[PDB]
Design a protein around this nucleic acid. Structure first.
Lengths: 493, 33, 350, 171, 64, 167, 128, 59
RNA sequence: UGCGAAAGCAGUUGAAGACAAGUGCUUGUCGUUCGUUAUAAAUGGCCU
């Protein structure tokens, strides 16, 4: 004897644009909160450490948002002029910020009152201030002076190294993982300049030509560096010093770019890229950087960020808009006498000789229509097909199963106009769909051949046929057209 | 068959192939018991 | 610690007789050591047992009657009642019972053909004849205050001298009915007193890791064999060729040429049994004939299991591995892994 | 010496049973384990064990067929709608009784049961029967081997306990 | 396969057998086993017999 | 170079008589009920029930006698033990040959072959209770008629004698 | 040895001369119920062809589903092709892909040929 | 229900034994009792999971 | 039923004997034969 097979749901051949495993993961960022800030939110950064709060730079203040609460918990308003960065150090204890006056302020993260170090990097604006990932003490600064000074926390009076050679504004700075000596900077020259801090420095070891003003440079992996500038982002390989891939799917000029890897998604690594067209799109580095998802916002996007790999809780996608709007999308993650009397349940037989298991795993509960078919209730199973709030696919199966069982007339004998209209109502809408058109044709044929006399004496049944004849006639036009476009489509080939 | 031999099936459902002492006495009695 | 109170191989080393307790009554059973018979018939478990109908009654001594010598295989059982039972394993009934006049328990027994010698707790010797089923003589030798062991020296076809032991060992002449010689024994009572060869008999005592090899004629300790742990059983091969002693800790030691620094010798090969999971299975008796060694252990509670190994080729330290039940998923022949009936056909699932 | 000293139990000993002939003791409990010990009075080592996943043991008992002495069996039951039988060492031959043949309404648990001997007079053959407690004064009697439902007994009020008595007739 | 209990006219079922039951028999001193012959009428070209020995205790195929 | 030889088995044997119902199965379960004997069209398989595997196979081709008899005749019944006289089986075929084979061992090349004397009768079935044996045979509206004989083995002549009982 | 029984495959071991499996490879009323009377006129899907790749890790099956009689769609047979996979240790074939009406509508697949090891390391096939 | 609630009653006198069990006898919450078919052994299980064994010397 | 593609193209579905019912006559049936390639319906639905 064998267990009863489960009724198999009907699955028509795949249509174009099916949902992909990558899409299903990214749709889960459903809850959307739209916050309004004073000015364009220029930069957004995530704390590398738990609880992974993210800081947003806007106008003359920096705000830290709690991950779980999704609300501001700290505010750094000491800055007089505009702010331009809020990056944390790797430890997450400190966050640095640049200013239009050119001063760089290092505050203790989560303690806005205390200022640890204040550096006057330059008289020009200091747009980029980023802590070195491998080394904690050294802090990098790039200013409109076009020199990207490398400061040391202990010695704040003179830069440790003062890289130069950029003929335009430098607004991008990146540290290559596994290469602490290497530093990457991209200027609006369209040139990405790489520097070696071990050597004397001040002259790039080599430059990579992007041909458009570079808005942000990110090192995805130790050997691959992705740079977004102009209307495209290009991925360069340092060992070969040539661009492996280039994607220009964006319309407006890409502005920000972030990379996350080894997170719980089906895609091992993701690359999110802002567009300045309202689009932030996801690319897969494992698949030649192909688009896998995208969002649309009200206006141009200036900053995008995603929760680090080890978020340890609900993940966050953050988008920054020039209008001052901040959009947050989140993927949420008896008595002792009685117990002593009943104390054996926890035991799993770890110390025993023979372990014997016969319990049959619980099968999912069967639906009403399946139970009726299993019990040979042909007419009742038909009724369960046409009930309010019944899935269209599930309605097609019970009709297909009954036909397959050879019970189409058997289900339709003891019926009148009162209980026939639900079937005709579905047929009126089911005829339109391609999947159910063939099944509707068979079932409608039988009821006519089986209830011709009742149709004459019932006016309500007639009207169902008049509109049905109108709809089937409309399908004839659609099917005939599809043959004509098919006919001419053969002419082209 | 992927070897050299060939298998063939008959309508009779037959698959043929075309191819290239005191101790000893006590030992016996103890087993009987 | 061990459910097997006493055990003894037959002289040929193919059959083991062991006594264990069922509820409050002792039962005597015989099991076959060999995995298969000479004819090739696979060996089977022997369910038959001899039950002692009295709770007080107990077996103190177990001795085999040599299979080749006598027509019927039989085992002689010394009892605490003061009588000796001749047991025939086939008929599974006590053929005849030798009774001493007194009621004192029999401490030890020994046999050479028709001769049968026993000692009571009162230190009185007795002589019996199997064919005649008669008590021949009984005597008490002075200065033999205790007698835990008796062994008869194998001289010719007759018994002319008996080796008996207490904390000290003695040699007695039957005709003179007097002690001939004395040997400095152990501090504890003597447990084993086997005679390895002529003018050489080994001796061991309860809770002792040392075996003294004495010369019957001269009287000087030729050697002292040392075990890692206490000694329970002893078996000698050939004529002092090899000696296997079952330790108390469940390991078996083999002494290779113990009769050839020189005073104290240690075991040369050590054998152990450990289950695949990791539990150690003690060895309670062993047998060693020429080059093969038979190891006996208990599985379940009292079922004896045996293995034959050629000790010559075994390394110095060798652990036999045995598959014992532990956390076994129970597979029924009529079910697959998932519990579906084998006859049942697999369903169609998209 | 304590029987369970060798291999302790992780729950209360819900039932005990000595083997009719062999020197074995059987234990069972809500730890879902059937432990058999060789009771000698001095060591009491464990012969074997059998863990039944998700099968609390409210009662267990040995059984030996009255005619075929070679037939040995162990029946165990709990607050479940099925009962286990263990014929008597690489594996264990365990069968599950879970069919009542139309009388499932009277029996929602096998936890209270006993095993007896019934002689089929018209053939003079003897076989075992498993007796169960029903919901409404009902006692359901099954065939020990085939598992068939043979007869049922009803009393008024709530059944609390029952026992079996034998009355000899002739040779 | 239907077991009719004639005392109360009830019945027990063993459905979804591999084929229609040509023959049925109780095999044992105590009815331990049931022997069945199955036909597999799907194959019209040949008659496909299968012998099924079921354990009466739990109605599982002891030998197919 | 090449050679042709049978390898596998065939369909299980059946009592192919329309009239008989409830006697279609010929396979028998041993007295100890530890193994099931099933006759095939070309062999006899002994399956051990506790392990669900074919412990023994008795091929007609290997034997000279069974090759001559079955290679048309078919087994009409199998009886545990030997009627003439612990693992013997007596096979009765439709024509009348009575063959005493052994399982759980090595098949003997000289089984105790016999032959019941039937006069235009096709043996249909045989059965016993305790030492007494009766054989049902078919003799010839398209309906077959049946005869019931009593079968005994005489030690003096070592032959099967059949005595008429019913029709 | 694989025998394409009607709507199922019987996997049989001729070295041991014993059946090893019986698997249902099609939809239909196969073991859901026991057909009786007019239901016995129904025809379950027929496995016309069954073939293996040279590697042996993929199974290709071709099926014909017969419509029930006395309907509008009582003369339009459905042709199905299925690709199954299993690891060697496993005993049940798992359906990986299903093509409904290959080659078009109501057009049979007369011949199936698995590819040689040279092309696609034996992971291809032709249908004619 | 309570600890040490075990009594042995002699028949046909129906007089409870006095010497055993005592205050020091370990029984706990007695939940299972068994008499051996022979040998006069008494096994008493308790809620703690301990099966304690006694021998009746009369048998 | 033959052939074929799946569509279809050609060709069949007879005679005797016996039985039951109704009134020698009529119909219906066949665990009866010869020859040719040659509606259903006993309230009766699948375990744990």
């Amino acid at each position: 004897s064998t267990a009863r097979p489960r009724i198999i749901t009907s699955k028509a051949p795949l249509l174009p644009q099916q949902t992909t495993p990558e899409q299903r993961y990214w749709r889960q960022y459903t809850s959307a909160q739209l916050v309004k800030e004073h000015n364009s939110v220029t930069h957004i950064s995530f704390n590398p450490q738990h609880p992974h709060d993210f800081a947003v730079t806007s106008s003359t203040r920096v705000q830290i948002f709690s991950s779980r609460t999704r609300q501001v918990i700290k505010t750094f308003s000491r800055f007089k002029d505009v702010v331009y960065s809020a990056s944390f150090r790797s430890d997450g204890k400190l966050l640095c910020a640049g200013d239009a006056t050119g001063l760089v302020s290092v505050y203790d993260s989560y303690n806005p009152r205390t200022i640890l170090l204040s550096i006057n990097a330059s008289t020009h604006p200091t747009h980029v201030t980023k802590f070195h990932t491998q080394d904690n003490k050294i802090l990098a600064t790039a200013s409109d002076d076009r020199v990207t000074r490398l400061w040391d926390i202990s010695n704040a009076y003179e830069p440790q190294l003062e890289l130069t050679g950029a003929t335009d504004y430098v607004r991008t700075l990146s540290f290559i993982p596994a290469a602490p000596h290497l530093v990457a900077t991209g200027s609006y020259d369209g040139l990405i300049r790489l520097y070696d801090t071990r050597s004397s420095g001040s002259t790039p070891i080599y430059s990579l030509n992007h041909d458009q003003p570079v808005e942000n440079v990110i090192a995805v992996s130790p050997t691959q560096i992705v740079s977004c500038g102009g209307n495209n982002f290009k991925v360069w390989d340092l060992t070969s010093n040539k661009k492996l891939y280039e994607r220009g799917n964006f319309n407006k000029a890409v502005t920000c770019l972030d990379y996350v890897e080894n997170f719980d998604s089906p895609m091992q690594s993701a690359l999110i890229a802002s567009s300045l067209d309202g689009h932030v799109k996801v690319f897969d580095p494992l698949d030649n950087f192909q688009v896998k998802f995208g969002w649309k916002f009200s206006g141009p996007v200036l900053s995008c960020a995603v929760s680090p790999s080890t978020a340890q809780g609900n993940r966050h996608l953050v988008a920054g808009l020039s209008s001052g709007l901040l959009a947050i999308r989140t993927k949420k993650k008896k008595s002792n006498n009685f117990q002593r009397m009943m104390r054996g349940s926890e035991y799993q037989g770890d110390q025993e000789h023979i372990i014997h298991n016969d319990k049959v795993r619980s099968q999912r509960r069967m639906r009403a229509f399946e139970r009726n078919i299993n019990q040979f209730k042909w007419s009742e199973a038909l009724d369960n097909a046409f009930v309010p709030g019944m899935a269209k696919e599930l309605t097609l199966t019970v009709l297909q199963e009954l036909r397959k069982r050879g019970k189409v007339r058997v289900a339709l004998y003891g019926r009148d106009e009162s209980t026939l209209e639900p079937l005709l109502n579905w047929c009126l809408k089911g005829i339109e769909d391609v999947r159910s058109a063939s099944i509707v044709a068979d079932w409608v044929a039988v009821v006519l051949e089986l209830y011709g006399n009742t149709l004459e004496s019932s006016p309500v049944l007639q009207e169902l046929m008049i509109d049905l004849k109108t709809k089937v006639r409309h399908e004839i036009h659609k099917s005939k057209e599809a043959q004509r476009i098919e006919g001419m489509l053969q002419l082209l080939t | 068959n992927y070897d050299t031999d060939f298998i063939f099936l008959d309508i009779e459902s037959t698959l043929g192939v075309v191819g290239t002492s005191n101790s000893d006495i006590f030992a016996e009695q103890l087993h009987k018991l | 610690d061990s459910p097997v109170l006493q055990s003894a191989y037959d002289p040929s080393g193919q059959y083991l007789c062991y006594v264990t307790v069922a509820l409050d009554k002792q039962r005597v059973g015989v099991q076959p050591t060999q995995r298969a018979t000479s004819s090739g018939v696979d060996t089977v478990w022997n369910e038959n047992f001899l039950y002692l109908e009295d709770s007080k009654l107990k077996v103190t001594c177990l001795k085999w009657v040599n299979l080749a010598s006598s027509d019927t295989v039989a085992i002689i059982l010394g009892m605490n009642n003061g009588e000796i039972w001749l047991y025939s394993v086939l008929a599974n009934e006590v053929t005849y019972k030798f009774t001493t006049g007194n009621s004192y328990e029999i401490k030890d027994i020994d046999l050479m053909g028709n001769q049968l010698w026993c000692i009571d707790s009162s230190d009185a010797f007795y002589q019996f004849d199997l064919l005649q089923f008669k008590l021949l003589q009984h005597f008490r030798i002075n200065n033999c205050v205790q007698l835990n062991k008796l062994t008869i020296v194998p001289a010719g076809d007759s018994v002319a001298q008996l080796l008996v032991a207490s904390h000290s060992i003695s040699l007695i002449d039957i005709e003179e009915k007097k002690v001939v010689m004395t040997f400095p024994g152990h501090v504890s009572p003597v447990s084993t007193l086997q005679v390895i060869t002529n003018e050489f008999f080994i001796s061991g005592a309860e809770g002792d890791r040392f075996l003294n090899v004495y010369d019957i004629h001269s009287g000087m300790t030729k050697c002292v064999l040392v075990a890692e742990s206490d000694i329970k059983e002893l078996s000698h091969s050939g004529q002092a060729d090899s000696i296997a002693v079952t330790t108390e800790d469940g390991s078996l030691e083999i002494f290779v040429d113990p009769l050839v620094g020189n005073k104290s010798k240690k075991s040369s090969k050590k054998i152990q049994i450990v289950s695949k999971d990791g539990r150690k299975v003690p060895i309670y008796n062993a047998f060693i004939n020429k080059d093969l060694l038979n190891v006996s252990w208990l599985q379940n509670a009292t079922m004896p299991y045996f293995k034959n190994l050629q000790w010559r080729e075994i390394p110095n330290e060798y652990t036999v591995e045995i598959s014992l039940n532990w956390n076994n998923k129970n597979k029924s022949a009529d079910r697959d892994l998932h519990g579906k009936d084998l006859a049942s056909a697999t369903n169609y699932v998209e | 010496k304590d029987a369970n000293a060798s291999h302790p139990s992780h729950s209360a000993i819900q039932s005990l049973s000595f083997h009719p002939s062999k020197p074995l003791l059987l234990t069972g409990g809500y730890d879902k384990t059937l432990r058999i010990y060789h009771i000698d009075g001095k060591t009491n080592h464990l012969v074997t064990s059998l863990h039944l996943v998700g099968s609390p043991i409210q009662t267990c008992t040995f059984y030996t067929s009255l005619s075929n002495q070679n037939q040995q069996n162990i029946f165990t039951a709990g607050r479940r709608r099925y009962m286990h039988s263990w014929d008597l060492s690489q594996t264990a031959k365990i069968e599950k009784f879970s069919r009542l043949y139309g009388h499932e309404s009277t029996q929602r648990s096998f936890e209270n049961f006993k095993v007896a001997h019934l002689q089929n007079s018209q053939t003079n053959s003897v076989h075992g029967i498993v007796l169960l407690q029903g919901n409404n004064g009902w006692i359901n009697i099954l065939h020990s081997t085939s598992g068939l439902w043979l007869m049922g007994c009803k009393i008024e009020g709530v059944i609390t306990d029952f026992c079996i008595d034998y009355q000899p007739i002739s040779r | 396969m239907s077991l009719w209990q004639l005392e109360t006219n009830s019945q027990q079922f063993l459905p979804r057998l591999n084929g229609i039951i040509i023959d049925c028999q109780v095999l044992g001193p105590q009815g331990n086993y049931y022997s069945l012959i199955l036909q597999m009428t799907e194959n019209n070209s040949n008659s496909d017999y299968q012998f099924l020995l079921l354990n009466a205790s739990d109605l599982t195929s002891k030998l197919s | 170079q090449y050679k042709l030889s049978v390898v596998s088995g065939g369909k299980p044997a059946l009592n192919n008589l329309s009239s008989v119902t409830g006697n279609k199965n010929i396979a028998r379960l041993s007295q100890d009920q530890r193994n099931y004997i099933i006759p095939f069209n070309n062999q006899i398989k002994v399956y051990s029930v506790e392990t669900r595997q074919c412990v023994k196979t008795l091929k007609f081709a290997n034997n000279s006698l069974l090759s001559g008899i079955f290679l048309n005749e078919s087994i009409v019944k199998i009886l545990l033990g030997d009627i003439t006289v612990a693992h013997l089986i007596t096979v009765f075929t439709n024509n009348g040959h009575v063959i005493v084979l052994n399982y759980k061992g090595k098949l003997v090349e000289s089984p105790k072959h016999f032959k019941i004397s039937l006069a235009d009768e096709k043996l249909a079935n045989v059965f016993h209770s305790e030492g007494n044996y009766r054989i049902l045979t078919t003799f010839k509206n398209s309906l077959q008629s049946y005869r019931l004989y009593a079968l005994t083995f005489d030690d003096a002549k070592k032959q099967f004698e059949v005595a008429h009982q019913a029709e | 040895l694989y025998f394409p029984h009607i709507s199922a495959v019987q996997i049989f071991d001729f070295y041991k001369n014993e059946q090893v499996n019986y698997q249902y490879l099609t939809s239909g009323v196969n073991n859901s119920m026991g057909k009786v009377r007019f239901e016995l006129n129904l025809q379950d899907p027929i496995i016309t062809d069954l073939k293996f790749t040279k590697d042996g890790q993929w199974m290709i099956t071709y099926e014909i589903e017969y419509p029930p009689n006395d309907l509008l769609s009582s003369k339009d047979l459905t042709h199905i092709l299925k690709f199954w996979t299993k690891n060697d240790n496993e005993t049940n074939w798992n359906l990986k892909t299903k093509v409904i009406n290959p080659h078009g509508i109501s057009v049979p697949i007369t011949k199936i040929l698995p590819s040689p090891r040279s092309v696609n390391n034996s992971q291809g096939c032709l249908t004619a | 229900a309570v600890k040490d609630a075990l009594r042995l009653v002699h028949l046909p006198s129906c007089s409870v034994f006095s010497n055993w069990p005592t205050s020091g006898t370990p029984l706990g919450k007695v939940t299972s009792v068994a008499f051996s078919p022979s040998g006069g052994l008494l096994a008493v299980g308790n809620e703690q999971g301990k099966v304690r064994l006694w021998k009746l010397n009369h048998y």
